[PDB]
Amino acid sequence: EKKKVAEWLAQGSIAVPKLLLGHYKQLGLGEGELVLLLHMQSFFEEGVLFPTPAELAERMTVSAAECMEMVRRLLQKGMIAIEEKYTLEPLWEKLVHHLYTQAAQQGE
Amino acid sequence: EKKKVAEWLAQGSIAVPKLLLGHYKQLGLGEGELVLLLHMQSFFEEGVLFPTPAELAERMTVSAAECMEMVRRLLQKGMIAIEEKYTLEPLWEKLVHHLYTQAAQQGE
Amino acid sequence: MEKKKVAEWLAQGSIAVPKLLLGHYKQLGLGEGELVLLLHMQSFFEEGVLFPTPAELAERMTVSAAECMEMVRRLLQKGMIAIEEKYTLEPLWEKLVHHLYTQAAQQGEL
Amino acid sequence: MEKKKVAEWLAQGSIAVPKLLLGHYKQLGLGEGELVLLLHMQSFFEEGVLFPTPAELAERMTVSAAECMEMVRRLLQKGMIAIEEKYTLEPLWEKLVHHLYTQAAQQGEL
Ligand SMILES: [Mg+2]
Ligand SMILES: [Mg+2]
Ligand SMILES: [Mg+2]
Ligand SMILES: [Mg+2]
């Protein structure tokens, strides 16, 4: 049935910078936390800007309490901030710092 | 300066299905109209769901009156609908129809 | 603050991760690590490397080359990816379509 | 309504179009047709075709092969793309970074 296929086609994508994919492990992030950041971005794109660890965990193989701990570690690492909303602003500033570092270290 | 670079890095992307890129000309769309659909998607992603032909045209090489005519042709072609909001729902249903057509015609 | 460098960062681009895959990989029996492994493979395909090795995959992940070969092996066996010489994700898509289809029908969405 | 087919549609993927390019290509002296031409070239690069020809470019556009060669020629001359053997968009990025930089400073955003 075509209306259904058309819906699936139009659902959208989350854009993951190749620079993030290529350097998250150096920023001290794991794959789990990376995915958790993709689920946050995706909640944002549908207007949910402060999703709970259980809304987040629903779509993950981790439990709600485990997800709460992972958000907590991200806040501590300085990878995300709370402003009633999450922001990834600090991820992209850690990321740029680290790329400026590698570049300086690699000559330029 | 790093906060600025980090911002630019985090601005985001509009995801353009390769299937749309590959078949818009067959749906009777031109490059101009294609871009106009990317600017609409982008207004949507920032919460502007009914942008005017002049908001649309600002970011384009076409004038506001020209943009108004292009939106009008899209509504007529059945590529977009108004619901106080635009929707591309009918694009993706024309697109799926056309892909089911080619497939049937190509054997399957 | 070097401009040619910034431009080279900005030109690297993005992997488009479908929301339907993000929304349902757990329901398909994938873990977060497999998901990210699939993203690294996509990223290799988009650089022309159609068959990356487990060492090339592991280099950007927190897992060893050996764990990464185990994970590619387990994805081949779950029928999420196949070798055709190149990896493909088609099998993943077929499983996701069959799932989406079953969810649609059970919600009377057909 | 064939499931293997739907899956093959869904597996085709997406071109990620940066919002900074969309937001400023007119200000760089590009037209909509050049923008879409750049998207078709990106799409070829992501299939491993690092140097598509103007005929391969024109096949999915409303313009002739000859207009498309004219447009690739005009992009080479505006210094939006370069040949290095392969096309690159680096020059475009350098112009966009230099623009973004100038806009930032004029809005006192530095
Ligand atoms: Mg690094
Ligand atoms: Mg066609
Ligand atoms: Mg599901
Ligand atoms: Mg500008």
UniProtKB/TrEMBL annotation, chains C, D:
Q: From which domain of life does this come? A: Bacteria
Which residues are involved in binding Mg(2+) 2?
H24, H99, Q103
Chain sites annotated for binding Mg(2+) 1 = H24, Q27, H99
Positions of the DnaD N-terminal domain: 17-106
What family does the database annotate? Belongs to the DnaB/DnaD family.
| Official protein name in the record | Chromosome replication initiation protein
